[PDB]
Structures are given as C-alpha cells and as structure tokens.
C-alpha cells in the first residue's frame, strides 16, 4: 500500500529547483573544499591557512564578473562558508542568489573504512541530518551533496561496498527530499591503478544500477534528484591510450544503459584530470551521436579553480587577473555544456 | 573481472534485429495463441477446433493485403505454426519474411502457482531452452516471447513474486541472447479488481525496476532487448473514471521513471481492452508532451484480430471481408504508433 | 578474496566478553533510560527530574546487595552515567566491574521516520561511532546496544524498513567489532495492535532472517555478537488468548528457524509486559522441549526496576526496602534463565 | 499477511520422514549415477554398459546382507531404477522399504553454463516438477535430490552464481514440499584448484548463508529439509597439508556459523576423496568438541561403492565377496556417524 512520501507541492519545489540548477548552458562550481584539502592547496601555493585567506579566496571565486551569471546555476559551499560574510556586508548565500545562483552545501562527515574489505570505505554523516537540512534550508541552501568513494582493485569493488554505499546514498536522499532540498548523489569511482576502459565501464554499470535500485527502494522522487558521476577513464598506471571520442562513447553508453530518464541532470566530476582535458571530454560527451534525454553539464571543483588559484598565489593585488583566469575556464565549461566548445 | 557474454558481432545482430522489429510505424502482431485459448475463441465463434481451422485462420491473418507490409515488423507464432505450410506451398516463416516481417515464437510452458502466496504464479519453460532456441534459429525465428503474470490484490504483488519473475525473465533473456535471438520481456500486470491509476502505477514502477535490476545483474545486452509492458489502467471493478490523457501521462511517467534509454523499443499489451480503446490510448501515449527516447509501438493479440475473427465466423467465403477488417485495425494501429491517429 | 576483518586475538576478546556476559544463570540489567523516558518515569512517581535524582536512582540500582553478583553479568548505561561517580567516590563503571559485571552503553541517537512508509522509522547514530567506541572502550565499556523499531500494521513491516534496519544494524556491529566492543543487535517488533501469534511469528522470521543475511554480508564475527529479540506475543488489542506454553513454543520455533548457533546468547526484551509475565514466559522458554543450542537469558529494563522504583517513590530512607524489591525480581529472573523458576 | 504453504499434517509427514532418514547411526547410499557417469565407471572396470549390467550392479548394491539394515536409512535412485524389478520379482522401491530404507530420486536435468561468468553453471530440471514429484510419490519416493555446482576460482564464485543457485534450490524445495517429498539441498563446492582451508571455508559460509536466506524467502518448512554440503577441504593442487582435526574444526565452524538448528540433519559428500579419508574425516567431525545440534551423517556415492565395484569387476560369481566389501565400508561409515569409528 502507498503512503506518499511527498505532497505534489513538494514534488513541485524539488522539480523546479532541479530544473533551475541544471538549466541549459549552466553548471556547478564546487567551492566545498574542507580545511584539510584546502590546507594542502594553500600550502602548495605557499600561504598560511587562516579563516581570512579562505574567506578571501572564496570572495575571489564568488564575486567574479557578471559574465559568469549565465554560467553557474549553483555553488556548493562548505558549512563554514554559509556563515561568512563578504566585505560588502552581504552574506555569501545572498551573494550567490543575487546573481542567479543556488546555494548548496556538502554535508557528509568523511569516509570510514569498512571491515573485512580491501581498503574500501563507506561514508559518514547521517545523524542529525533532518535538523541540519532544516537549518540549511532556513539559511538558503536548496540542494546538497554527498560523496561516496569506490576504488577499482584486484577483486574490488566488492558487492558489500556497492550495496552499503547505495543504501547510504538512498537514505541521505530520502532525508534531503523530506526537507525540500534537492539531493545530488555522487557515486565516485577512483581512477587510481591500471585498468582499461572496459573494466571501469563495467564497474560503472554495476555501481549505477545498484544505486538506482536502492533509490527505487526508498521511494525517491527521481525528478528532483541530480546525478554526479565520473567519466569512465582508464587508470593512471594503465598503458593503453584512447581518443576522447572513445571515452565519450563509453560514458554515454554507461549512462544510457543505466540512468532512468526522469533524473533531471547529470553533472560530471573532473576526477584528477587536467584543466583542459575535462572540458575537452565534456565537449566530446555533448557531441556523442546517441540519444541523451537529460542535461549533461559540469560540476568541477579543481578544474574550475586550480589555475585561477595559481594565478592568485596568495596576493590580493593580482586578484582581478586571477579572477579573469577563473572566468576563462567557466566560459569554456559553459561551451562544454552545449557541445559548441572548440579549443 | 569482465568475461564478455557477447562478441561485438553478436551485439550487432541483436541490435540490427531489434531495430528492424521496432522500426518507426511498425508493430507486432501476436498470433501466438495456444490451443486452449484459441479453442475458447473458436468455441465462441461457433466452429470446431481442428488443426485445419487453426491453420486456415492463421492463413487469413498472415497472407492479408500488401498494405500491411509497412505495418507489421514481426509476427509472434505458436510452436506448431512454424511447421505448418500455406496452401501455396510456402511455409509460414517464409511467408512472414517475404513481406518484410520477422518470425518470433512464444516459448514459455505456462504458469505455475507459487507456494505461500495469494494466488501468485511464476512462469515455466526454462529446460532445453538453448537447444530449442538453436532449433528455432535454424527455422528462422529471430525473436522470442515470455509471459509472466502478476495480479494486484490486497497485499499482492509480494516481493517474492516480483523477485522470482524478474530472475526468471533475466535468465530467459540471457539464454536467448546467447543464441542470437532478441528477447522480449513481458511484465504483465493483471487489470482485474478495483484499483486506481495511482496504485497500479506504483506497482508498475516496482515491477519494472526489479526487472531492470535483474537484467543488469545477468549482463543482458539491453540494446538488443524489447520491453512489453501493459498500459497503467484502473481495475475492472474500479469506480473512478479517467480521461485517456491521464492514462497516457501515467504510462509515460511509469516508463520515464524506469526504462533505461538503451532499450530499443516498447511494445504495449492490449490487456482486455476494447479494439478501439487500445488504439486511442496508444495514440494518446504517442502524443504525450514529454521526452520519450525510444520507439513506442503496439503488440496486440486480441486487439488486432478479434473483430476480424468475428467477421470470419468460420466460413471461408467471407475471408476477404474478414481480412479487410483486420487491415483496418492494423492501419489504425500504425497511426497509433506515429501519433497521427484520429478516430 | 578474503582480507580478514579481525585478527584471531580480536576474535578472542569478542568471544571471551560475549561468554562472560551470557554466562549460565546471568542476565542483563538495562539502566540505559534516556532523560525523556526517565523523565516520564520520575513524573509518574511524582518527583522532579534532576541529575541528582537520576544519579541517586542508579545508585539504588547499582549498589544493591551481593546476592545479585551471580545474577547480573552486565549493565547497560546511558552515556551520562559513565561519567557519574557514586558517593563512595568510585565511578559507576568501577562499581559494575567490582562485583563481576560488565559495562555497556546505549549508543543510538534515536529514531528517524522513513519517507513513504506508514509510520515506519529507522535508527540514527552512526557518525563518529568509531571514535566514540574507542572512547568508551577506554572508559571500560565492553559491549554496546542499538535499538531499531518495527511495528506490525496493515501492510507493514515493508521490505524497505526491514532492509534498511538490517543494514544499519550490520554497519553498527561491524564498527563495534572493529574496536573490541561486543555488539548487541536488538530487532524490536512493536507489540501494539491486534494480531495473532501467527502473524507476529511470521514477521519475526522475516526480520531475523534479513538481519542475519546482512550480518553475513558485512563479515560480522558472529561468535562475538549477542541477539536481543522480543518474545512473539499477540497484540494488545488482539482478542484471542494463549497459554504461556504456546508463546514459548512459538518463540523457540521462531529462533530455531533463524538463529545460527554460533551466536553466543539470546537476551529477551520485556516489551510492555507485566513484571511477573516476563519471568513466567522466560521460565517457559527455558522449559521448551526442543534443542536450543545457545544461552537464553533476560535483558529487562522495566521488568527489573519498575516495582522497585514504585517502592522507592523518590524518598531516600525507603531505599533498602526498594533495593530489596529489585533483588527479588533479579533472583526470579535468574531462575528464569535456568528454567528452575516457579512462581 | 500469512497464507500458510503447509497444513500441520503436511509438516507432520515432512518432519517424520526427515527424522526417519537421518536417524542416529543411519546414512544415505547414493546409487543415483546417470548413464554417462556409470558408463565411465563400467568402462573403467572393463564391461559393456547395458541395462542388464546396471540393473545387476544395483541388485548387488541393494540386496546386500541384513547387517546394513541399521546402516542405510535411505537410498537415492536414478529415475530408471524405480521401474526396474529384481530377479525375485520385487521392484526396487519395495526392496528398499522392506529392509527399512526410504526411496529417493535424483531429479535434476543437468548443469547449464551461465553466460558472462568464468565457467560457472546453474542447474536445470524445474519443468513438470510438481507432476513428476506426484508420480514419484505414487511410486514410493519420499525424498529427492538436486545438485548445484560451484567452483573456486580467481574471482569465482561470483554473486550471480550463488544467488541463482540459491534461488533455484529454494524453488525446487518449495515444489517438493508441496507434494509431500522431503527435499535435500546439495550446495556442492568443487574441490579442484589450489586453495587453502581459509578461502574454501569463506566461500562455504557465503554460499550456505545465501542458500538459507533464499529458503527463508520461499517459506520453506526447514524442519522437513535435509542439507547436503561438502567438507571444507583444500584444493587438489594446494601445497599446504592439514591434519584431519583442522578439517573437522573448519567444517563444524562453517556449519555452526550458518545452519539454523531446525534443519533436521546434515549429510556429507565424499567429494573426490579416498574411500578411507571420508570415513576418517566424518569420524573426526563427529568428535569435534563443539555443540552440534543436528544429526551428522554420510551420503556417499563413490565412497561406499567404488572398491565394491572394483571387487565385482563385471563377473557375477564374485558377487558375494564384492557385496561383503560394500558392507565393510557401510559398517565403517555407520561408526563414522556415531563418532565411535577407529581405523
């Protein structure tokens, strides 16, 4: 017997937010880096990690030129960045919503190793999640993000890891959809190792199928859900070389065999690629001559901001130039969303 | 680790046959009625059930006018009809392939009641299936058909019935794809009872999701598979009345939430409807303003041939008129495949 | 391929602790009541809820006579009670271990309603659980407790609720076994409603089978795990009446069809029964003439302490008499563990 | 909601037959060899395979001395042997029931390779099984046998093979229990290869857990079911050497972690061992100092009859001596059932 999880108005908000995020030509900037990863990135660039530098760097990211207004539909933030204010006086969620963007927040509490596996981990962060999503919904967060990690090994991914990560993602998305927050499932598959297109494509199919079975099990309103997969790409130690067209064909085959078409949009990871390779691959994916009945766009953390961070270097007066650099990649990625990119 | 079930040439035959079957404007005639059901139908029309009458009736179905040549892409036969010859001397598979059609065969051995359930049955017919499909492949059968039955009850469909029927369908489709025969999965849901659009749509989602999970489990090459679902329609004792647009919206929602887009085509059942209601509903489904990234066509057993059987009546000299009647429905259903039908 | 979750020494501690807890004639006192439930219980008895009254009441429970030393193998505490000290100066974990008992702690963070179900809830409390169990292991907690809730309804328990609760229990038990803490799974089935012995026995089989499948999936060392089920008992509004022998037969049938015999012991709930009915039923269960290859004992929260709380009334000078009352039930329950109870 | 598969009288026959089969000190002779395997065995001994030689050899097996009357509780036959008569005039089922034995029949139709796996096969034989079991029940068969095969490889047994074989075994046992025939599940794991005690024990746990989950899913009355597992033994190419006590400890650990204690008895395979090694191992298993709450006995096809077949050689006049040889092993195996064997 059916007791509906959602009223039709709840489905209306989830569908409208998911359509406004993944709108044609728009993408996702992921400024959600925690203090450890951003500490590594500020230590590489050669500055001290303080709250002021992090706030100023996200100022450099967020208040860039109005040319990125038809580029970014939504920005993912850390928890701390929701309660930081810009030097103009405006809080960063209002900064995001003022230029048409949507506020999100990365909500997981890290990765926990699973017993008995070969280095396989699950994700943490389920306690207090309804109250926290209610609080973030009061502060203007309209979508969320959760990151599960899987690695390709000798006999990994085992069935235990895929089942547990799929069940956790479905539980998370149910809780987020209860509170009027569009969830984004991110089934990340680690690119480390040496494996061809074929095996990585294979485990991509198994992982995405288990995810969508668990989503059907937990009554998830799939019209208000976004998918964040990685491009099927060979391992870093894999010796074989492939054109970008084969990678695009393999991605659209791995999606067209799994993703049911009510899922509103597909946002890709960069996954340790270069700044240009991700845009080239996404432009290839948007040019693949099969029938792709959803939005195909980008959600790039490092691939948007890495070289702009390099051109910043920790000095304020370089800012505009660094900001200009960021805009460049954004504009390129916008073309990568519509297939009209050419390098 | 991946050991591929299919060579790329095997995928090439399966994809080419599935594309030739479900080709735009073409549909499936199901003349696969067994001796009991066709015995009931000949007893209703008032003639004796012999081999000669069955052969002559399928002669009346199969050698109709050449106007049905851009109508039927494929015909489903009983096992016996593959070894019957027409009075011209040509065997019925050659009759089918001569006018552009593709030979199929219904291969299941009936329904067996499941213990402990409330009148829920599974399907039979797995033994010797590889040899039988090899034999039918030698005789010109290029696709198959398997029919599982589920009924909507108080606490039915239980999880046991859906799991067992999905596993049996996947096992069947693996065996058929091994031998170069395109399988057609038919997840029939019984329209008996009293239930709204909502509950029947709900159990349609659960059943189709479990089916596609089991197909992903058994490495089924989904580009060479056809789907045969029923239209989500209220029960026969249900008191509420619905327009055909609501039924079309519910069907395309129940498909767009489940069917991955590599599945080549969707052929509907008639499911106890009238001869005109099925064509009206299919014309509505082909006019629904959502994105349907596959072929939507008909596979009508009774809805093609019932009134033509009525105009036959068991007398040979009425034949042409009866045949003319059949052509009428076929032409209508062809328009129901392309959305340009108007009654 | 097998990467063992546990070293053999880890299996040795888990087995030794589980054997010391469930030792023949010993049981579990559950003083783990949170502030809301104990607030309701102090408000019923007519005293104000303060930290001093809670500490003093658990003083009344814990420092009772030495006759309960061969009665209680282990005590379950709230988190707060681990950091309260007795008026002698000794902390309550040392109080427990001084008279032969083992310290436990209830670790879940409550129940969260599942979307789309009919009032079905999951359990919360997975974040930070490895660090918290390491901290409690430093403070002397050797076992844990987690409480999932399921209710018998019209079409409930659904498959979603049982699957999610089983996966959460297995994840919890893996985390606890990683840190050297013996987990106790508690699959509680709510006794509310009107349902016979038959349906409650049925859903007990389904729930326990799904739990043990998920435990086999997560590589749980079942020799170091305790099971906390409820006795299969009809609903509160059920009109049919049953002898205690039928309830004992149904419990031992529902366990002997599911529990694999390496699971070290089975501790029952009281589940809203009377103070005497639970002891009578447990004495019947220990007299059932089938082969029960494990320890069958009690884990009684209310059924040990309710009437002793009544004889306390919130006044200190009644203490000993109230404590004497507690000892009475404990002694009775000890006989209920060995089948030699007679009321 | 519960609709009981079995009336209590049906449970009474299943329990009584299962108790009479596995009765203390009794075992199972498996004369169920099909024409191919027995053709290989008659070709090794150097005689022509005819119906007369097969009938005469099973005469040599079945009408041995009355000292085997407290040895064999039941005999498994091929289908053909049920309709062969002895030279006295009595049919072989009456021969079996006259000396206290129970007639069984091997009912599967062989093994079929699964697509996409690495040499993994499922089992066949489900069609017409209710009618065939009704027919064998009329002829005096009171139990059955079904044999699924799994091999230990690099990345095998995969989850697909274990799931499919468990579902097929449960479906088979439901059908057999519907007709009043006690099923015997045989989850055979192939001993070929090189693998330690540890990995074979591991996959034994996974396989048996999946089997019992599928049996709980299909409402199987486990008091009327027998289990036929193999002893966990290293591979034929494995270099490490183990005492028989370690093999006995590993078997009783692999059973005590999985088998719920209502399953009436456990009958072992010989599995390519010597004639003496199987009896030594079973005597060790019956001497393992853990709590084994079921009957542990033998079901030996080759290990009972191989050397007796050797002492036959295809000549009639050696018969008695050959028969005497058979009795020897039987008597030894009877002691192997009670732990009082000493070689």
Numbering used by the authors:
A (entry chain B), B (entry chain A), C (entry chain D), D (entry chain C): 2 to 344
Give verbatim excerpts from the published study on this entry:
To test this, a cryo-EM data set for aldolase was collected at 200 keV using beam-image shift and analyzed. This analysis shows that the instrument beam tilt and particle motion initially limited the resolution to 4.9 Å. After particle polishing and iterative rounds of aberration correction in RELION, a 2.8 Å resolution structure could be obtained. This analysis demonstrates that software correction of microscope aberrations can provide a significant improvement in resolution at 200 keV.
Then, using these new beam-tilt values, we performed another round of 3D refinement. This new structure refined to a higher resolution at 3.6 Å and had a lower B factor (−202.0 Å2) [Fig. 4(c)], indicating that the per-particle quality has increased.
